[PDB]
Write a protein that binds this ligand. Structure first.
Ligand SMILES: *[C@@H]1O[C@H](CO)[C@@H](O[C@@H]2O[C@H](CO)[C@@H](O[C@@H]3O[C@H](CO)[C@@H](O)[C@H](O)[C@@H]3O)[C@H](O)[C@H]2NC(C)=O)[C@H](O)[C@H]1NC(C)=O
Ligand SMILES: *[C@@H]1O[C@H](CO)[C@@H](O)[C@H](O)[C@H]1NC(C)=O
Lengths: 596, 192
């Protein structure tokens, strides 16, 4: 007698208990994020504590159920997911030491502070330093802030990160993974699916192959941006060298978005900002979200539940409380779907409403799944589904069709090439940054980097992979990786690279089924019912099927392809190729701003 | 007059696993008013249209009232399967009555959760028609005895519906009254 039946009954218990418990927890989390008081912090904490204790209970129930004898794939997947036990494998002492280290690092990051020689005032990342790195054109305050961050804060995290790698390497080797990097890569693992499988190292191989296919586009973006920044900082930049890490738009060069002002190809053509016309036509938050609803419904997607319209916070409360205004899409469960957003009447918040309501659409589609499979196929699917909506909604065709733009309104390639260049500064710019960050973390966990070469490798890989040189020599007393929110606080990073590639596979596929003519960026998916149906045949899956199968359900391809990304950017590609006809493409890795 | 007001307008309904039965006898019933109330999201009769059973006489009537999620209201019908149909309230294949049902979100849902209503999640076998099982014996799923306690392969057979005034329509509370009409050799005391 196969205990499969016992595991069936156990999962039937788990679904129904966890439903109410996670509903409690999500509701208390909401009430803190909608009221934000000490009472509400306490209620949210108690709800989450009951929920987390329920997991420490039920994961350890599920450990017994041997996955091997579960031939109803769903069951095996629910049990596998619940049996991802992580830190419970470690000794209680070491679980506590690692939680101690993680809390230390996270609070160091969120509370670190560096001091002006200027004002003797001691700034911080989110207030002062980020405004410096995003809005400053002075070479020297950007260098000051960059370096002071990596020194006052990065140095304190260094031994914490060493012991962190140590303990989580043990924590991974306890769950039969080869290292913590393999543990994280265990997200994309697919097993027991003839023709649809996916090993944990094929993520390595696919990421490397597709980044190789990305390299030329990035090299020409890099040459062009180096040229413009050399025009805006001549004595500091080499025409052939890497980019000084502190001059890249934010504290890390993660996104080059804040460089657009210096790198805009056509500096005098009108940028599409419909925020003025929305204010001109007496639109409010209700109107923005109604229009997003209409967009989705045009594509044969369901309407928002009235509980959504009754329970979502779409305006600055400005009544009796304060709110964490970070736009979030909530799936509390039991058919309750909500959106937090302190919405302004702006084109940015308009597209953001489309993005968050796309998260909502993904949630509502797979609500018929068993909780444990109520999620994106893998970690990057959700945000890609969110991003393709903003793509389809920022297009002239859409903006005209909703009447937020003139019916005669056209758009001049200059305008279009400006838009593509901005899109590349944000999207293409983060791809090598992210690939190399995660490659360095992965190798550190694998052991391929000795502790005493920890940064020496990092910056070599900044010179080699991302074409970015540090402006000051850094010894192992630093830990400039950990200087990013994600590394200091233990998050897998490859999700952004995979999400980027997924969103363009998706948007290309849906624009094909839409019967879209012309270049792929302007494609609207509105009114393309067929595109929405092709998309739903993936959304309703959740993670009940392998992510290779979920991807095939949209793009007909079982794996990750940059050809849709390259097709999206081919006009800007052919633009950079002829701009750079009097420039050096690539980078020598030996030039540094500090050989003087 | 028949006391349908106390079956339908009852202040609180029973949990579906202890479904309430009221016997109806020796009274005149007007069923046309129960339907033309137009306040029932479900009023589906598998015996005869509500028209003739105002023009008809039965020996006993049975009003079975309880509460179940809207998505589960499809199970209160002959020939259906699911949790509620197998382990709570079963209608026979030759069922000759009506199923009436309305949305009780304004009554059975409250902020923070209304855990008053239960339902049976596991059972050894399926119910016969019009059977009621209200035992709280821990469901043994594996082969080790439970010793009357929840644990490994050992679960309480009853779980609580969470009726919130924010749930989706299908996870909202619904009040159901199933009307059964019988004929015997005894004279018919229920007419209209
Ligand atoms: C695709 O879906 C969009 C959804 O927004 C449709 O947009 C608008 O759809 C209406 C109804 O078909 C079109 O008729 C217009 O109604 C307005 C109402 O103010 C009226 O002023 C116009 O003279 C016209 O009668 C409307 O043209 C259209 N919007 C625009 C900017 O064209 C769109 O029609 C759908 N595509 C179709 C049906 O091919
Ligand atoms: C927020 O919390 C306060 C307690 O500080 C409470 O009085 C209020 O009812 C809560 N809800 C709101 C303001 O919507």
């Amino acid at each position: 007698s196969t205990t499969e039946e016992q595991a069936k009954t156990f999962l039937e218990k788990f679904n129904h208990e966890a439903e109410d418990l996670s509903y409690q927890s999500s509701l208390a989390s909401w009430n803190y994020n909608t009221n934000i008081t000490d009472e509400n912090v306490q209620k949210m904490n108690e709800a989450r504590a009951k929920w987390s204790a329920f997991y420490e209970e039920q994961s350890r129930m599920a450990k017994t159920y041997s996955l091997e004898e579960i031939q109803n794939l769903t069951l095996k997947r629910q049990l596998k997911a619940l049996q991802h036990s992580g830190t419970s494998a470690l000794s209680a002492e070491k679980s506590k030491r690692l939680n101690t280290i993680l809390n230390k690092m996270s609070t160091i990051y969120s509370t670190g502070k560096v001091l002006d020689p200027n004002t003797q005032e001691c700034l911080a990342l989110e207030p002062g330093l980020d405004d410096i790195m995003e809005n400053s054109r002075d070479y020297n305050r950007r260098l000051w802030a960059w370096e002071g961050w990596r020194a006052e804060v990065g140095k304190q995290l260094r031994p914490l990160y060493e012991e962190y790698v140590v303990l989580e390497n043990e924590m991974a080797r306890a769950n039969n993974y080869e290292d913590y990097g393999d543990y994280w890569r265990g997200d994309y693992e697919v097993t027991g699916a003839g023709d649809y499988d996916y090993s944990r190292d094929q993520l390595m191989k696919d990421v490397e192959r597709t980044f190789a296919e990305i390299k030329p586009l990035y090299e020409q973006l890099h040459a062009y941006v180096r040229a413009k920044l050399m025009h805006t900082y001549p004595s500091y930049i080499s025409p052939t060298g890497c980019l000084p890490a502190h001059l890249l738009g934010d504290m890390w060069g993660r996104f080059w978005t804040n460089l657009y002002s210096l790198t805009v190809p056509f500096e005098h053509k009108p940028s599409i900002d419909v925020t003025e016309k929305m204010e001109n036509q007496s639109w409010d938050a209700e109107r923005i979200f109604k229009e997003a609803e209409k967009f989705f419904v045009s594509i044969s997607l369901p309407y928002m539940t009235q509980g959504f319209w009754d329970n979502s916070m779409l305006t600055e409360p400005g009544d009796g409380r304060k709110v964490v205004c970070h736009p979030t899409a909530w799936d509390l469960g039991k058919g309750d779907f909500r959106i937090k957003m302190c919405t302004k009447v702006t084109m940015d918040d308009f597209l953001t409403a489309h993005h968050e309501m796309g998260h909502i659409q993904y949630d509502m589609a797979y609500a018929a799944q068993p909780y444990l499979l109520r999620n994106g196929a893998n970690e990057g699917f959700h945000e890609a589904v969110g991003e393709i909506m903003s793509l389809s909604a920022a297009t002239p065709h859409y903006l005209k069709a909703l009447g937020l733009l003139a019916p005669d309104f056209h758009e001049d390639n200059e305008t279009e090439i400006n838009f593509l260049l901005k899109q590349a500064l944000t999207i293409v710019g983060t791809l090598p940054f992210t690939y190399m960050l995660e490659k360095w973390r992965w190798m550190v966990f694998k052991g391929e980097i000795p502790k005493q070469q920890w940064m020496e490798k990092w910056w070599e890989m900044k010179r080699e992979i991302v074409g970015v040189v540090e402006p000051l020599p850094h010894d192992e007393t630093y830990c400039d990786p950990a200087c990013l929110f994600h590394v200091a606080e233990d998050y897998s990073f490859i999700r952004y690279y995979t999400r980027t590639i997924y969103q363009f596979q998706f948007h290309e596929a849906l624009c094909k089924t839409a019967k879209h003519e012309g270049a792929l960026f302007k494609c609207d998916i509105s009114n393309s019912t067929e595109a929405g149906q092709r998309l739903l045949q993936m959304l309703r899956l959740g993670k009940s099927e392998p992510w290779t199968l979920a991807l095939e359900n949209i793009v007909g391809i079982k794996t990750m392809d940059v050809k849709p990304l390259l097709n999206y950017f081919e006009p800007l590609f052919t633009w950079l190729k002829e701009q750079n006809r009097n420039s050096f493409v690539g980078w020598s890795t030996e030039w540094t701003p500090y050989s003087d | 007059l028949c006391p349908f007001g106390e079956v339908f307008n009852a202040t609180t309904f029973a949990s579906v696993y202890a479904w309430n039965r009221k016997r109806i006898s020796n009274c005149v019933a007007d069923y046309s008013v129960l339907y033309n109330s137009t306040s029932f999201s479900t009023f589906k009769c598998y015996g005869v249209s509500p028209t003739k059973l105002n023009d008809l006489c039965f020996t006993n009537v049975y009003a079975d009232s309880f509460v179940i999620t809207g998505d589960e209201v499809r199970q209160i019908a002959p020939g259906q399967t699911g949790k509620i149909a197998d382990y709570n309230y079963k209608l026979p294949d030759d069922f000759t009555g009506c199923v009436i049902a309305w949305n009780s979100k304004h009554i059975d849902a409250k902020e923070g959760g209304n855990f008053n209503y239960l339902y049976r999640l596991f059972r050894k076998a399926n119910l016969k028609p019009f059977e009621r099982d209200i035992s709280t014996e821990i469901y043994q799923a594996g082969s080790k005895p439970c010793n009357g306690q929840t644990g490994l392969n050992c679960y309480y057979p009853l779980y609580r519906y969470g009726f919130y005034p924010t749930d989706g329509v299908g996870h909202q509370p619904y009040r159901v009254v199933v009307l059964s009409f019988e004929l015997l050799n005894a004279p018919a005391t229920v007419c209209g």
